[PDB]
Ligand binder design. Structure first.
Ligand SMILES: C/C=C1/C[N@@H+]2CCc3c([nH]c4ccccc34)[C@@](COC(C)=O)(C(=O)OC)[C@H]1CC2
Ligand SMILES: C/C=C1/C[N@@H+]2CCc3c([nH]c4ccccc34)[C@@](COC(C)=O)(C(=O)OC)[C@H]1CC2
Ligand SMILES: [Zn+2]
Ligand SMILES: [Zn+2]
Lengths: 358, 359
């Protein structure tokens, strides 16, 4: 029994029947506080496109009942005897993964988001063999290595999507030098990840073009986010005039799309950084890749030290997501709106004020 | 008309009918020596898989009659008034491309192989609008920037495949730091490009595993080429035992193949360098790419300063291709053997002694 598997009671919303994807009230339990654990009372949980893909039953390996949500901002209500960096009552946030092997090269050099055995935010077994429950719940318990200190100046709700969308965009750009004035960057897709890529790029001084198939988004892209230009990808005239003009492109789309027009936008030796995860494979245009000497680079989240640095950057430059704050019992309707793209640009669930037991 | 479009006569072998891919004797002409040109009497021409892909009619943009061959070693018989780096009588070699726009960033910075308007070795228009004829011919004339000095100590026939296979392997490794001892390198495919990547890596001190679908190649890979290990690609125990063990993999195959097993062989942040050009599309497994923070990097030939440097390295370290020297009128059978992989590891055509004028 989920309410009997562990000693401390907990509750949230869960997809009980994977074939419908409907979340409903759900009681379970969480492990006791180990020596290095932090109990977190959850304030806000962001909703990302991976949550939606999970509720659409598109990830076979996940276990159900599924409690998704992996953009958690909360309060530490309890720390184990060996926690010293975080005091009870502090505002904290959780990384988009919950553990690593602790022994490989990535873990030992604090690049642990690339551990081959990274434990994702929910739906798979933790080190103690039990399935992980995510942020659509009242409280969570996390090993202190994966708990960040949340800056006092950052809106807890507006900053919650920095914990997976923001860090993915921030890290991709920091690791590949796309954070310096003089770089011309393309951002493909203007959803949660894309709109945060535009904000971080502006704060670095990067010149940014948004590349989109939705012309109604030109106005938000230029006026709201500060993009230097808007490229309608279906307009062959604009596409040909941008050939060879980008140093890098950050591709955030969750659907299958052609890669070669994107490679033709790159100058020689430019990088196409892939951070979205389409559920179907893409075609590798070999001659454009070879002849331009171009690179396809994958990137996922960021390591926990980079995430702390990202949060402190976001607090100093007032970088938050554009959010709609929702009650938990709206989550099923939000999923539909997220599926249609009717959100500008992030849902954030107010857990503390709107979740109650089943 | 091919014989009348330029002032100097020439001859070789050509695919006249693109739908059969059969080469036959062919008379044409080549331009006069301009001020910056070098006329080259062709001694040897290497045959690569791209020649075969061209003769299989898989590249729409080529024009016919098609004279392929782009691994040319020769003797300078004539230089334009403004040539000084090359003397008549010198052994020379030609890069696998013939010109560039001359004005873009890649051009002005001696990275000209990545010029967006690079003129390839044959089958497309030159700066004067005429179709280029490749190395399966008696002489060629090339702008001096794309002519290399060929080392005296290097075998002209064993060194001919350095001009496209060798340079592609050398540059890919020099450009991405796969030339430093301590790197564990995978070489996928043990054909012309693959076997020169192994030699170049052993000469750099790099630990090299050959990844192959042909177990019969294990003895040649370990004993003749010097590979440190041989990984049979179809053996799941072996593939699973190598997961996460490679720093980089150079993928040399000319056919479609699954990409995700190769990405699993890479450690996190590892590089998969693509130098073969399969004619059908490849599938990109994003989840492994994303999960590992891994890279797919394309690379093509090398610049001409790098090609010269590759040649002097190959002379000082005795790096040559393992070749079968063939007469030109065997080229159609060689194409068949090349299609089946029945060659260890390069055909080189002896142009000077076996090519004669048609009829
Ligand atoms: C940063 C979150 C993304 C999301 N998507 C898809 C995959 C995925 C991840 N978490 C999930 C949880 C449930 C279902 C799917 C996923 C994750 C988590 O981030 C890290 C460093 O683990 C991932 O597994 O990358 C290895 C990230 C990749 C892109
Ligand atoms: C070095 C040769 C390869 C070959 N294949 C395929 C494509 C191609 C090139 N030459 C040909 C000539 C005839 C038909 C196809 C090709 C080339 C060479 O161009 C250079 C050296 O700059 C290429 O990149 O052409 C833009 C190389 C890429 C892989
Ligand atoms: Zn690890
Ligand atoms: Zn150029």
């Amino acid at each position: 029994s989920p309410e009997e598997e562990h000693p401390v009671k907990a509750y949230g919303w869960a997809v009980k029947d994977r074939t419908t994807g409907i979340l409903s009230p759900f009681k379970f339990s969480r492990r006791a506080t180990g020596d290095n654990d932090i109990r977190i009372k959850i304030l806000y949980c962001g909703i990302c496109h991976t949550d939606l893909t999970s509720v659409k039953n598109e990830y076979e390996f996940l276990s159900y009942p599924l409690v998704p949500g992996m953009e958690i901002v909360g309060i530490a209500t309890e720390v184990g005897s060996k926690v010293t960096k975080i005091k009870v009552g502090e505002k904290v946030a959780v990384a988009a993964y919950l553990g690593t092997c602790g022994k490989c090269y990535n873990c030992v050099n604090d690049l642990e988001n690339y551990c081959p055995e990274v434990i994702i935010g929910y739906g798979t077994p933790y080190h103690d063999g039990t399935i992980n429950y995510g942020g659509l719940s009242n409280e969570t318990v996390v090993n202190e290595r994966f708990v960040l200190r949340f800056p006092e100046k950052l809106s807890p709700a507006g900053g919650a999507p920095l914990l997976s969308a923001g860090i993915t965009a921030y890290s991709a750009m920091r690791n590949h030098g796309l954070d310096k004035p003089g770089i011309h960057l393309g951002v493909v897709g203007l959803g949660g990840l894309g709109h945060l890529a535009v904000k971080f790029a502006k704060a670095f001084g990067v010149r940014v073009t948004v590349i989109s198939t939705t012309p109604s988004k030109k106005d938000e892209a230029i006026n709201n986010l500060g993009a230097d230009a808007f490229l309608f990808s279906r307009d062959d005239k604009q596409m040909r005039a941008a050939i060879g003009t980008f140093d890098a492109i950050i591709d955030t789309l969750a659907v299958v799309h052609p890669i070669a027009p994107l490679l033709d936008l790159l100058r020689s030796h430019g990088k196409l950084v892939l951070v979205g995860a389409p559920s179907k494979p893409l075609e590798l245009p070999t001659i454009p890749l070879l002849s331009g000497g171009k690179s396809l680079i994958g990137s996922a989240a960021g390591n926990v030290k980079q995430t702390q640095e990202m949060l402190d950057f976001a607090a100093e430059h007032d970088i938050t997501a554009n959010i709609e704050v929702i009650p938990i019992d709206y989550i099923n309707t939000a999923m539909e709106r997220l599926d249609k793209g009717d959100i500008r640009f992030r849902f954030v669930v107010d857990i503390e004020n709107t979740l109650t037991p089943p």
